[PDB]
Coordinates of C-alpha atoms and ligand atoms in Angstrom, one line a residue:
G9 CA -0.5 0.2 0.2
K10 CA 3.3 2.3 0.3
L11 CA 3.9 5.4 2.7
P12 CA 2.1 8.6 3.5
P13 CA 2.6 11.4 1.7
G14 CA 4.1 14.4 2.4
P15 CA 7.0 16.8 1.8
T16 CA 8.8 15.8 -0.9
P17 CA 11.5 13.3 0.1
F18 CA 14.7 15.5 -0.6
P19 CA 17.8 13.1 -2.0
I20 CA 20.0 12.0 1.7
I21 CA 19.1 15.2 3.7
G22 CA 15.2 14.9 3.9
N23 CA 13.2 17.9 5.2
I24 CA 16.1 19.5 7.5
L25 CA 15.3 23.0 5.0
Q26 CA 11.2 23.0 5.5
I27 CA 11.8 22.2 9.4
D28 CA 11.2 24.6 12.3
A29 CA 14.4 23.6 14.5
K30 CA 13.2 26.5 16.9
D31 CA 9.4 24.8 16.8
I32 CA 9.3 21.9 15.0
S33 CA 5.6 20.9 16.4
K34 CA 4.7 23.9 14.1
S35 CA 6.2 22.7 11.5
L36 CA 4.2 19.4 11.3
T37 CA 1.5 21.1 11.4
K38 CA 1.6 23.1 8.9
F39 CA 2.4 19.9 6.6
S40 CA -0.4 18.0 7.7
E41 CA -3.1 21.7 6.5
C42 CA -1.6 19.9 2.8
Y43 CA -1.2 16.3 3.2
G44 CA -4.0 15.2 5.9
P45 CA -3.7 13.6 9.7
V46 CA -1.0 11.2 8.4
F47 CA 2.4 12.2 6.3
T48 CA 5.9 10.8 5.8
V49 CA 8.8 13.3 6.7
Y50 CA 12.1 12.4 6.1
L51 CA 15.5 13.4 8.0
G52 CA 18.1 11.1 6.1
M53 CA 16.9 8.1 4.1
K54 CA 14.7 7.3 7.2
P55 CA 10.9 8.2 7.0
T56 CA 9.3 9.0 10.1
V57 CA 5.2 9.1 9.6
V58 CA 4.0 11.1 11.6
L59 CA -0.3 11.1 13.8
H60 CA -1.4 14.4 14.0
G61 CA -4.8 15.2 15.7
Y62 CA -6.6 12.7 18.4
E63 CA -8.2 10.7 15.6
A64 CA -5.3 9.7 14.5
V65 CA -3.3 9.2 17.1
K66 CA -5.8 8.0 19.5
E67 CA -6.6 5.5 16.5
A68 CA -2.3 3.9 16.8
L69 CA -1.7 4.7 20.0
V70 CA -5.4 2.9 21.4
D71 CA -6.5 1.0 19.1
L72 CA -3.8 -0.1 17.2
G73 CA -1.5 -0.4 20.7
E74 CA 0.8 -3.8 20.4
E75 CA 1.5 -2.4 16.5
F76 CA 3.0 1.4 18.0
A77 CA 4.2 0.0 21.5
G78 CA 7.9 0.3 20.2
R79 CA 10.5 2.6 21.0
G80 CA 13.1 4.3 18.4
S81 CA 16.6 3.5 18.5
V82 CA 18.9 5.8 20.3
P83 CA 22.6 5.3 20.4
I84 CA 23.3 7.0 23.5
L85 CA 20.7 5.2 24.5
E86 CA 21.5 1.8 23.3
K87 CA 25.4 2.2 25.1
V88 CA 24.3 3.3 28.3
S89 CA 21.3 1.7 28.6
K90 CA 22.2 -1.7 26.6
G91 CA 18.4 -2.3 25.7
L92 CA 17.6 -2.4 29.3
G93 CA 14.5 -0.4 31.4
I94 CA 12.2 1.6 30.7
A95 CA 12.0 4.7 29.1
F96 CA 14.1 2.9 25.4
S97 CA 13.7 -0.5 25.9
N98 CA 11.9 -3.1 23.4
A99 CA 9.7 -6.4 24.3
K100 CA 10.4 -9.4 26.1
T101 CA 12.2 -6.4 28.1
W102 CA 10.3 -3.7 28.3
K103 CA 7.1 -6.4 29.1
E104 CA 8.8 -7.3 32.3
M105 CA 10.0 -3.9 33.5
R106 CA 6.9 -1.8 33.0
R107 CA 4.5 -4.1 34.5
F108 CA 6.7 -4.3 38.0
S109 CA 7.4 -0.8 37.7
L110 CA 3.7 0.0 37.4
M111 CA 2.6 -2.5 40.2
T112 CA 5.9 -1.7 42.1
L113 CA 4.6 2.4 41.6
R114 CA 1.7 2.4 43.1
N115 CA 0.2 4.4 45.8
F116 CA 0.0 1.3 48.3
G117 CA 2.9 -1.0 46.2
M118 CA 5.9 -0.2 49.0
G119 CA 4.7 -1.0 52.5
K120 CA 2.4 1.0 54.6
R121 CA 4.6 4.4 53.9
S122 CA 2.4 5.1 50.8
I123 CA 3.6 7.5 48.2
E124 CA 0.8 9.9 49.5
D125 CA 2.8 10.2 51.9
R126 CA 6.3 10.9 50.8
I127 CA 5.0 13.3 48.5
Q128 CA 3.2 15.0 51.7
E129 CA 6.2 14.8 53.7
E130 CA 8.6 15.7 50.7
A131 CA 5.6 18.8 50.3
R132 CA 6.4 19.9 53.4
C133 CA 10.1 19.8 53.5
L134 CA 10.1 22.5 49.9
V135 CA 7.7 24.8 52.2
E136 CA 10.8 25.0 55.1
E137 CA 13.2 26.0 51.7
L138 CA 10.9 28.5 50.7
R139 CA 11.0 29.8 53.9
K140 CA 14.7 30.2 53.9
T141 CA 14.3 32.5 50.8
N142 CA 13.4 35.3 53.5
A143 CA 10.7 36.6 51.2
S144 CA 13.9 38.0 48.4
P145 CA 14.0 37.8 45.6
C146 CA 14.7 34.3 43.6
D147 CA 14.9 31.9 41.1
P148 CA 12.9 28.8 41.4
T149 CA 14.9 26.6 39.0
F150 CA 17.2 25.0 42.0
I151 CA 14.5 24.0 44.8
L152 CA 11.0 23.3 42.3
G153 CA 14.0 20.4 40.9
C154 CA 14.8 19.2 43.9
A155 CA 11.7 18.2 45.5
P156 CA 10.5 15.9 42.6
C157 CA 13.8 14.5 42.6
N158 CA 13.6 13.6 46.6
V159 CA 10.1 12.5 45.5
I160 CA 11.4 10.0 43.3
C161 CA 14.6 9.1 45.7
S162 CA 11.7 8.1 48.8
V163 CA 10.0 5.8 46.1
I164 CA 13.6 3.9 45.0
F165 CA 15.9 4.5 47.8
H166 CA 13.1 4.8 51.2
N167 CA 15.0 7.7 51.9
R168 CA 15.1 11.6 51.0
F169 CA 18.5 14.5 50.7
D170 CA 18.9 17.5 51.8
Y171 CA 19.4 20.3 50.0
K172 CA 22.3 20.8 50.8
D173 CA 23.5 17.4 50.5
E174 CA 26.9 17.4 48.0
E175 CA 26.3 14.2 46.4
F176 CA 22.5 14.7 45.8
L177 CA 23.3 18.4 43.9
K178 CA 25.8 16.1 42.1
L179 CA 22.8 13.5 40.8
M180 CA 20.6 16.2 40.0
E181 CA 23.1 18.2 37.9
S182 CA 23.8 15.2 36.2
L183 CA 20.0 14.6 35.6
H184 CA 20.3 17.9 34.1
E185 CA 23.1 18.4 32.1
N186 CA 22.1 15.2 30.2
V187 CA 18.7 15.9 29.4
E188 CA 19.9 18.9 28.8
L189 CA 23.0 18.4 26.4
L190 CA 20.7 16.0 24.8
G191 CA 18.1 18.0 24.0
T192 CA 17.2 17.7 20.5
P193 CA 13.8 18.8 18.9
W194 CA 13.8 15.0 17.2
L195 CA 15.6 12.0 19.2
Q196 CA 15.7 10.3 15.7
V197 CA 18.8 13.0 15.0
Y198 CA 21.0 11.1 16.4
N199 CA 20.5 7.9 15.1
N200 CA 20.6 9.9 11.2
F201 CA 22.9 11.5 12.0
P202 CA 26.4 9.3 12.9
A203 CA 28.5 12.2 11.4
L204 CA 27.7 14.2 14.4
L205 CA 29.3 11.7 16.8
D206 CA 33.2 12.5 15.0
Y207 CA 32.3 16.2 14.9
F208 CA 31.9 15.5 18.7
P209 CA 33.3 13.8 20.5
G210 CA 32.7 14.9 23.8
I211 CA 29.2 15.1 24.3
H212 CA 28.8 11.9 24.4
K213 CA 31.5 11.7 27.3
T214 CA 30.2 13.7 29.4
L215 CA 26.8 11.9 28.4
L216 CA 28.7 8.6 29.3
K217 CA 30.4 10.5 32.5
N218 CA 26.9 11.6 33.9
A219 CA 25.3 8.1 33.7
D220 CA 28.1 6.7 35.4
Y221 CA 28.1 9.0 38.0
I222 CA 23.9 9.1 38.0
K223 CA 24.8 4.2 38.2
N224 CA 27.3 4.2 40.8
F225 CA 25.1 6.4 43.0
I226 CA 22.2 4.3 42.4
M227 CA 24.6 0.9 42.3
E228 CA 26.2 1.8 46.2
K229 CA 22.5 1.9 47.9
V230 CA 21.6 -1.3 45.8
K231 CA 24.3 -3.0 47.4
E232 CA 23.5 -0.9 51.3
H233 CA 19.2 -2.4 50.7
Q234 CA 20.3 -6.4 50.3
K235 CA 21.8 -6.6 53.8
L236 CA 18.8 -4.3 55.6
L237 CA 16.5 -6.3 53.1
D238 CA 12.8 -7.4 54.8
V239 CA 11.9 -9.9 52.2
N240 CA 8.2 -10.2 53.7
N241 CA 8.4 -6.3 54.2
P242 CA 9.5 -3.9 50.9
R243 CA 10.2 -0.2 51.3
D244 CA 10.1 0.4 48.4
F245 CA 11.7 0.7 44.9
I246 CA 14.8 -1.3 45.1
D247 CA 13.3 -3.9 47.6
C248 CA 10.6 -5.2 45.6
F249 CA 13.0 -5.6 43.0
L250 CA 15.4 -7.5 45.2
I251 CA 12.3 -9.5 45.9
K252 CA 11.5 -10.3 42.5
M253 CA 14.9 -11.4 42.2
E254 CA 14.9 -14.4 44.6
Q255 CA 12.3 -16.9 44.6
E256 CA 11.1 -16.1 41.3
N257 CA 12.7 -17.8 37.9
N258 CA 13.3 -14.2 36.1
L259 CA 17.1 -13.6 33.8
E260 CA 15.2 -10.4 33.3
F261 CA 16.1 -9.3 36.7
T262 CA 19.3 -8.8 37.3
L263 CA 21.6 -6.1 39.7
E264 CA 22.6 -4.3 36.4
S265 CA 18.6 -4.4 35.2
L266 CA 17.7 -2.5 38.5
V267 CA 19.9 0.3 37.9
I268 CA 19.2 1.1 34.2
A269 CA 15.2 1.0 36.0
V270 CA 15.7 3.6 38.2
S271 CA 18.0 5.3 36.1
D272 CA 15.2 6.0 33.6
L273 CA 13.0 6.7 36.7
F274 CA 15.3 9.6 38.0
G275 CA 15.9 10.2 34.4
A276 CA 12.3 10.4 33.1
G277 CA 10.8 11.5 36.4
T278 CA 12.6 14.7 37.4
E279 CA 12.7 16.8 34.8
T280 CA 9.3 16.8 33.7
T281 CA 8.1 17.3 36.9
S282 CA 10.4 20.3 37.7
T283 CA 9.0 22.0 34.8
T284 CA 5.9 21.3 35.7
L285 CA 6.4 23.3 38.6
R286 CA 7.8 26.1 36.9
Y287 CA 5.7 26.8 34.2
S288 CA 3.3 26.5 37.1
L289 CA 4.3 29.3 38.9
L290 CA 4.8 31.9 36.1
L291 CA 1.2 30.9 35.0
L292 CA 0.7 31.0 38.4
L293 CA 2.4 34.9 38.2
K294 CA 1.2 35.8 34.9
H295 CA -2.5 35.0 35.5
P296 CA -2.5 35.9 40.1
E297 CA -6.9 35.9 39.9
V298 CA -6.1 32.1 38.8
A299 CA -3.9 32.0 41.9
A300 CA -6.2 33.8 44.2
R301 CA -9.2 31.6 43.2
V302 CA -6.8 28.2 44.0
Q303 CA -6.5 30.5 47.4
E304 CA -10.3 30.8 48.0
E305 CA -10.6 26.8 47.5
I306 CA -7.4 26.2 49.3
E307 CA -8.5 28.2 52.3
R308 CA -12.2 26.4 52.3
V309 CA -11.7 23.2 51.9
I310 CA -7.9 22.9 54.6
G311 CA -8.0 25.5 56.0
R312 CA -4.5 26.6 57.5
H313 CA -3.6 24.1 59.9
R314 CA -3.2 21.1 58.2
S315 CA -1.2 19.7 55.3
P316 CA -3.1 19.2 51.9
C317 CA -3.6 15.4 50.8
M318 CA -5.2 13.7 48.0
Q319 CA -8.6 13.0 49.0
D320 CA -8.7 16.5 48.9
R321 CA -8.7 16.8 45.0
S322 CA -11.9 15.4 44.5
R323 CA -13.6 18.3 46.7
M324 CA -11.2 20.6 44.7
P325 CA -12.7 21.0 41.8
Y326 CA -10.9 24.6 40.7
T327 CA -7.5 24.0 41.7
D328 CA -7.7 20.4 39.8
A329 CA -8.9 22.3 36.5
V330 CA -6.1 24.3 37.5
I331 CA -3.3 22.0 37.3
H332 CA -5.0 20.4 34.3
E333 CA -5.3 23.6 32.4
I334 CA -1.3 24.1 33.3
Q335 CA -0.4 20.8 31.6
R336 CA -2.4 20.8 28.7
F337 CA -1.2 24.6 28.4
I338 CA 2.6 23.6 28.7
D339 CA 2.7 21.1 26.2
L340 CA 5.2 19.9 27.3
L341 CA 6.3 17.4 25.3
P342 CA 5.1 18.5 21.8
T343 CA 6.0 15.4 20.1
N344 CA 5.6 13.0 22.9
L345 CA 8.6 10.1 22.9
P346 CA 9.6 8.5 19.8
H347 CA 7.6 5.4 19.0
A348 CA 7.9 2.9 15.8
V349 CA 6.1 -0.3 14.8
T350 CA 6.9 -3.8 16.2
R351 CA 5.4 -5.3 13.1
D352 CA 4.3 -4.6 9.5
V353 CA 1.0 -3.0 9.8
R354 CA -1.9 -1.5 7.5
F355 CA -2.9 1.8 8.9
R356 CA -5.9 2.5 6.9
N357 CA -5.0 2.9 3.7
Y358 CA -1.0 3.1 4.5
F359 CA 1.8 0.5 4.5
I360 CA 4.1 0.8 7.5
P361 CA 6.4 -1.9 7.5
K362 CA 8.2 -3.1 10.8
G363 CA 10.7 -0.8 12.6
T364 CA 9.4 2.5 11.5
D365 CA 9.8 5.4 13.5
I366 CA 6.3 7.0 14.8
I367 CA 5.8 10.5 15.5
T368 CA 2.4 11.6 17.0
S369 CA 1.6 15.1 17.8
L370 CA 0.3 15.4 20.9
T371 CA 0.1 19.5 20.9
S372 CA -3.0 18.5 18.3
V373 CA -4.7 16.6 20.5
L374 CA -4.3 19.2 24.1
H375 CA -4.4 22.0 21.4
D376 CA -7.0 20.7 19.9
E377 CA -9.5 23.7 18.5
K378 CA -12.9 22.5 19.3
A379 CA -12.0 20.3 21.9
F380 CA -10.7 23.3 23.9
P381 CA -11.8 27.1 22.7
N382 CA -9.3 28.8 22.2
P383 CA -6.5 26.3 23.0
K384 CA -3.5 28.9 23.2
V385 CA -5.3 31.2 25.8
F386 CA -4.6 30.3 29.8
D387 CA -8.1 29.8 30.7
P388 CA -9.4 26.6 34.1
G389 CA -12.6 26.8 32.2
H390 CA -11.5 24.2 29.8
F391 CA -11.4 21.9 32.2
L392 CA -15.0 23.7 34.2
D393 CA -18.3 23.4 33.3
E394 CA -21.1 25.6 33.5
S395 CA -21.8 24.6 37.2
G396 CA -18.3 24.6 38.4
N397 CA -17.1 21.2 38.2
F398 CA -14.3 19.6 37.1
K399 CA -15.0 18.3 34.0
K400 CA -12.9 15.6 32.0
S401 CA -11.5 15.4 28.0
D402 CA -10.5 12.8 25.8
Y403 CA -8.6 15.1 24.8
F404 CA -6.2 15.8 27.8
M405 CA -3.2 13.0 27.0
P406 CA 0.0 14.7 28.2
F407 CA 0.9 11.9 29.4
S408 CA 0.4 10.5 26.2
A409 CA -2.0 6.7 25.9
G410 CA -1.3 3.2 25.2
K411 CA 0.7 0.4 26.0
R412 CA 3.6 3.3 26.3
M413 CA 1.7 5.7 28.5
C414 CA 4.0 7.4 31.3
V415 CA 4.0 5.4 34.6
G416 CA 4.6 7.6 36.4
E417 CA 1.7 9.6 36.0
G418 CA 0.1 9.1 39.7
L419 CA 3.2 9.7 41.2
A420 CA 3.3 13.2 38.7
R421 CA -0.3 14.2 39.7
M422 CA -0.1 13.7 43.2
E423 CA 3.7 15.8 43.2
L424 CA 1.3 18.9 41.4
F425 CA -1.6 18.7 43.9
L426 CA 0.5 18.8 47.2
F427 CA 3.3 20.4 46.0
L428 CA 0.8 23.5 44.0
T429 CA -1.9 23.5 47.0
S430 CA 1.2 23.2 49.7
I431 CA 2.9 26.5 47.9
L432 CA -0.2 28.4 48.4
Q433 CA -1.2 27.7 51.2
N434 CA 1.7 28.7 53.2
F435 CA 3.0 32.2 50.1
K436 CA 1.5 34.1 48.2
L437 CA 3.6 34.9 44.5
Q438 CA 5.1 38.1 44.2
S439 CA 6.5 38.9 40.4
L440 CA 9.3 41.9 40.5
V441 CA 7.3 42.7 36.8
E442 CA 3.8 43.2 36.2
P443 CA 2.1 40.4 34.1
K444 CA 1.6 41.8 31.1
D445 CA 5.5 42.3 30.5
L446 CA 6.4 38.8 31.9
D447 CA 7.1 36.1 28.6
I448 CA 5.5 33.3 29.0
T449 CA 6.1 31.5 26.0
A450 CA 8.6 28.5 25.3
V451 CA 11.6 27.6 23.8
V452 CA 11.0 23.8 22.9
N453 CA 15.0 23.0 24.1
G454 CA 14.7 20.1 23.2
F455 CA 11.8 17.2 23.0
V456 CA 11.1 18.9 26.1
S457 CA 9.2 22.8 26.3
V458 CA 11.2 24.7 28.6
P459 CA 9.9 28.0 30.3
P460 CA 12.1 31.4 30.1
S461 CA 13.2 32.6 32.9
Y462 CA 12.3 34.5 35.7
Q463 CA 12.6 35.2 40.0
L464 CA 9.8 35.7 42.3
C465 CA 9.6 36.3 45.9
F466 CA 7.6 34.0 47.9
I467 CA 5.9 36.1 50.5
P468 CA 4.4 34.3 53.6
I469 CA 1.2 34.3 54.7
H470 CA -0.5 33.3 58.4
Ligands
LIG501 C1 4.4 15.8 34.4 C2 5.6 14.8 34.7 C3 5.6 14.3 33.6 C4 4.8 14.4 33.0 C5 3.8 15.1 31.7 C6 5.4 12.9 32.0 C7 4.9 12.3 30.4 C8 5.7 11.3 29.3 C9 5.5 11.0 27.9 C10 4.3 12.7 27.3 C11 6.4 9.8 28.0 C12 5.6 9.0 26.7 C13 4.7 8.3 26.4 C14 4.9 7.5 25.2 O1 5.9 6.5 24.9 O2 4.4 7.8 24.4 C15 6.8 9.8 29.4 C16 7.3 8.1 29.3 C17 7.0 7.9 30.8 N1 7.3 8.5 31.6 FE1 6.9 10.1 31.8 N2 6.2 12.2 32.8 C18 5.8 12.8 33.6 C19 6.4 12.2 34.8 C20 6.8 10.8 35.2 C21 7.5 10.5 35.8 C22 7.3 11.5 38.1 C23 7.8 9.0 36.5 C24 8.6 8.3 37.3 C25 8.6 8.5 38.5 C26 7.7 9.1 35.0 C27 8.3 8.1 34.2 C28 8.0 8.0 32.6 C29 8.4 6.9 32.0 C30 9.5 5.4 32.5 C31 8.2 6.9 30.5 C32 7.8 5.3 30.0 C33 7.2 4.7 29.8 C34 7.3 3.1 28.7 O3 8.0 3.6 27.7 O4 6.8 2.3 28.2 N3 7.7 10.2 34.0 N4 6.2 10.6 30.6
LIG502 C1 10.5 11.0 29.6 C2 11.1 10.9 29.0 C3 12.2 9.8 28.8 C4 13.5 9.2 28.8 C5 14.3 11.3 28.8 S1 16.3 10.7 28.4 O1 16.2 12.7 27.8 O2 16.6 10.2 27.0 N1 17.3 9.9 29.2 C6 16.6 9.0 30.3 C7 17.4 11.1 30.3 C8 16.6 12.2 31.0 C9 17.9 13.0 32.3 N2 18.9 12.1 31.7 N3 18.5 11.4 30.8 C10 19.8 10.4 30.5 C11 20.4 9.8 31.5 C12 21.1 9.0 31.3 C13 21.9 8.4 29.8 C14 21.5 8.9 29.3 C15 19.7 10.0 29.2 C16 13.5 12.1 28.9 C17 12.0 12.1 28.8

């Protein structure tokens, strides 16, 4: 049946001159207007079928789930991850790592001390670190990145760290630097451009270094976890993992397999959560009435005394619509993470051969013009009915959908709820600039939309 149409394949180096590296998503849309929902693009002689719009995206990711459940190959990760872990693994190895991870990352999947409990504990430490800024102007980047990294640590090693902890610092930096240096609009760039490896050998050297620091950091906590292991009472990810390695015969589960899975979790759950939080505060600065209506709902449903908790979310339709609207507005991963077909598939009246790269435009869904009238305008009303009640949307897909859908989806959502309610409970946000002169436009560095730099003061309220 042949591959889908698209910007006529220029011999050798594909469509680079036709793409805007600064906003690749904007180009996929400029192409959908002229070729429809499903089209093909070239980076080299390697094709990439783009799925644009909810219909094409849901059909592929959902209805044709296992057919698209593959991950595109990346040389730098193939070296570091060795085809293991969760994010870039495939088939058997992936199937097993993902299911174990979904089972272990449930709110009450690692003992009596739940995930919510670990998040609440962290949200308390967060408020303190903000209070230590003495209400003086500051850039929240550093501390809004410490909190999510700590949530992950407690979930994995059953232990959090101090923001002044030397080791923890090197780790956050290593995790940031690696996403910052690897940051590119399309991840397949690396596999479609080998000469890039010869022009800049140092890039990969730094990546491997950080990757190995991250590995050793994780490996150390693992060796000492083995000694204190209680087979009947697993307190974290490692513990459950170390137990799966015993009386259960699985060669897929080894110490190395664990280290790589934990790196993936850190890598996938730190920067994304952090950036969303940074972007959250910024949007609350840009739209202070929203920040005030959240504070109103917080005072009314939680009060000024106790720490917020997940039960509150159901009773806080407005705050929830705010969190949904932030995730939807920022479009954290415009083009999702790259997929690939696992078998030859007939996508409608097209033919897609096993291994072909796939790219789903989440921006097309999240910003659907009909599902969200005025999709480029930030408005909590998108997730609120006429009675002020929370209103779900099939188009709310910031975490993707299908067999590959984010695995830390619950843990991230709990983080955004607890952290944002706790901050607006104890603080008022003050900007040096007035709202109309504040830039909120995203600069898509890599596969992650990052918010412009900014400072503010956290004014304690009591
Ligand atoms: C606001 C925060 C987050 C957002 C917006 C986000 C979103 C996403 C998206 C869009 C994907 C790709 C899905 C696909 O392949 O189609 C993804 C995958 C994944 N995320 Fe997240 N994520 C966030 C946080 C987390 C957290 C906190 C963790 C871990 C504790 C995590 C773990 C991962 C992993 C491991 C995958 C790969 C799953 C697989 O390939 O089967 N994420 N996430
Ligand atoms: C959801 C998600 C998965 C994977 C990545 S990544 O940039 O490919 N990666 C796993 C990552 C993020 C931070 N560090 N790393 C990393 C760690 C070790 C080696 C290579 C990359 C980013 C986001």
